[PDB]
Amino acid sequence: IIGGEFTTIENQPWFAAIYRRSVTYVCGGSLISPCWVISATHCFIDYPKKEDYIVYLGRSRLNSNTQGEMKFEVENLILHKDYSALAHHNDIALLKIRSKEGRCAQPSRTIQTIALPSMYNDPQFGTSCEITGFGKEQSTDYLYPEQLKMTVVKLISHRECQQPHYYGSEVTTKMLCAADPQWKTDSCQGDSGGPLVCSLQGRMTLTGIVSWGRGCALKDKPGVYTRVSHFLPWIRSHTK
């Protein structure tokens, strides 16, 4: 997260921290149900083996064990069969979680689920949503921050993101662009798979999943997110 502010998991109780076995951070995710975390396929496409992954819920620091946190194994790693790639299509994935005790996540003050959107029902463009993650704080940074961060970006219409000086056609209707009017804040490397959360009809909703972007917080280069309200059938079937 470029700019923005630091926060603790309490403010984003659905945020999942995903790691791969050296134990290195991979990407974020979002808890949509006790046993299911949703994220981005590009984060695992190169190492599909579900055995190399560790998912944490209720964790606020990168390399420290936030008290009240829960460690899980990936029972099932479901990548979208139609994935293609920056410009990344169908960049969405599901991780079925279960602890060694063989159980799913238990809600608490630091562990909650996030509601899914209604099909093709997204906030009006210009709306302000939140993005959370352990991604770089600066494009030039070589390290990821130790403390969780979040910031605010505004939804951008596909017509405007479609423009050549922006992303041209690299962006599709299955994608949502979001950015700061001053391009002062944005998601960056390491935030992929993380949640783009918007308020809809008085309810925090998982409108997007950090997917890709040209650099970070660069003028005319929005952050691109997988448009969740366009993948509900896919999500429900694979989570039955």
Binding site: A85, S139, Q189, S192, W212
Partner: peptide, 12 residues
């Protein structure tokens, strides 16, 4: 390899 989309990618 520095942008979103290429994390945890072998080539990188």
């Amino acid at each position: 390899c520095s942008w979103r989309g290429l994390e945890n990618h072998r080539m990188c």
